[PDB]
Design an enzyme around this catalytic site. Structure first.
Site, mmCIF file in Angstrom:
data_model
loop_
_atom_site.group_PDB
_atom_site.id
_atom_site.type_symbol
_atom_site.label_atom_id
_atom_site.label_comp_id
_atom_site.label_asym_id
_atom_site.label_seq_id
_atom_site.Cartn_x
_atom_site.Cartn_y
_atom_site.Cartn_z
ATOM 1 N N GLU A 1 55.067 71.467 24.937
ATOM 2 C CA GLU A 1 55.220 70.697 23.727
ATOM 3 C C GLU A 1 56.362 69.735 23.968
ATOM 4 O O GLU A 1 57.399 70.118 24.534
ATOM 5 C CB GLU A 1 55.556 71.593 22.533
ATOM 6 C CG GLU A 1 54.474 72.619 22.264
ATOM 7 C CD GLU A 1 53.244 72.028 21.604
ATOM 8 O OE1 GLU A 1 52.300 72.800 21.298
ATOM 9 O OE2 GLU A 1 53.246 70.800 21.343
ATOM 10 N N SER B 1 47.785 71.854 18.826
ATOM 11 C CA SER B 1 48.361 73.128 18.399
ATOM 12 C C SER B 1 47.399 74.275 18.390
ATOM 13 O O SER B 1 47.851 75.398 18.317
ATOM 14 C CB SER B 1 49.010 73.021 17.031
ATOM 15 O OG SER B 1 50.147 72.176 17.029
#
Ligand SMILES: *C(=O)N1C[C@H](NOS(=O)(=O)O)CC[C@H]1C(N)=O
Length: 259
Positions: free
Chosen positions: A139, A43
């Site tokens: 993602e 992230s």
């Protein structure tokens, strides 16, 4: 250095692989540990994607107000904000804030898609003179963090320099830089990572990450009152695919390099 032996020992005791890069703007000094090794950003790559959108907004007026549809089928492994807006639209500003402050993976996917895909985020890093950063996947697969896999990785040195350029330097326009700093300062996920190794009163803007192999990361800009800021990247990864995260290691690294 004493800091080097301390980081070396922290790494040894952890059984993992620690990457640290600190820039102290007070004297432009750096503390580096495995700083040129690649680590899966997880992230923490969200900063580069949000910054790419910020850069795009300098030449595309009203860009941050542009609406993006959220579908239930867009939902991935972690998206606390986007899941509240299924069949609604989120602005690119809302997506950037969700990605940066809540680490919403759908938000990151919309940012990646907005700029044209993972390669476009990488092109943006290249435009800022970062030749190390590479975003390869969306993602959630960008978080696999397989040891030796160069996909979706950067080095602590590269990320620290880029983070400095983005938040303090001239990589972005004045308002865009201030926006990124505001977003990072408003992060809600960082209390156990770099922040936990610093004096409680210091102002910190950071972006955490976690992934496969107990990958535990945090990238931060730290503004101690009455001092010049520090830029700190702490990347950590482990031998076991299902290793639990080790935010304590990032906090210990932060403490070592800031004392
Ligand atoms: C980012 O690394 N991810 C998205 C989300 N991040 O939260 S974190 O920054 O507090 O770790 C959850 C973990 C991770 C992922 N595997 O998607």
């Amino acid at each position: 250095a004493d800091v080097q032996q301390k980081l070396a020992e922290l790494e040894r005791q952890s059984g993992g692989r620690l990457g640290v890069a600190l820039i102290n703007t007070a004297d432009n000094s750096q503390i580096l540990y495995r700083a040129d090794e690649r680590f899966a950003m997880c992230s923490t790559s969200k900063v580069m994607a949000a910054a790419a959108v910020l850069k795009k907004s300098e030449s595309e007026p009203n860009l941050l107000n542009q609406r993006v549809e959220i579908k239930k089928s867009d939902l991935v492994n972690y998206n606390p904000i986007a899941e509240k807006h299924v069949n609604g639209t989120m602005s690119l500003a809302e997506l950037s804030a969700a990605a940066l402050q809540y680490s919403d993976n759908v938000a990151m996917n919309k940012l990646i898609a907005h700029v044209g895909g993972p390669a476009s985020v990488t092109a943006f890093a290249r435009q800022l003179g970062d030749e190390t950063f590479r975003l390869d996947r969306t993602e959630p697969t960008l978080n696999t963090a397989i040891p030796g896999d160069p996909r979706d990785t950067t080095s602590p040195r590269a990320m620290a320099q880029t983070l400095r350029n983005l938040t303090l330097g001239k990589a972005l326009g004045d308002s865009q830089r201030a926006q990124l700093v505001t977003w990072m300062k408003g992060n809600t996920t960082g209390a156990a990572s770099i922040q936990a190794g610093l004096p409680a009163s210091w102002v910190v803007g950071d972006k955490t990450g976690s992934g496969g192999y107990g990958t535990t990361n945090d990238i931060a800009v730290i503004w101690p009152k009455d001092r010049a800021p520090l830029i700190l990247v702490t990347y950590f990864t482990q031998p076991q695919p299902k290793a639990e995260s080790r935010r304590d290691v990032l906090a210990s690294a932060a403490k070592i390099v800031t004392d």
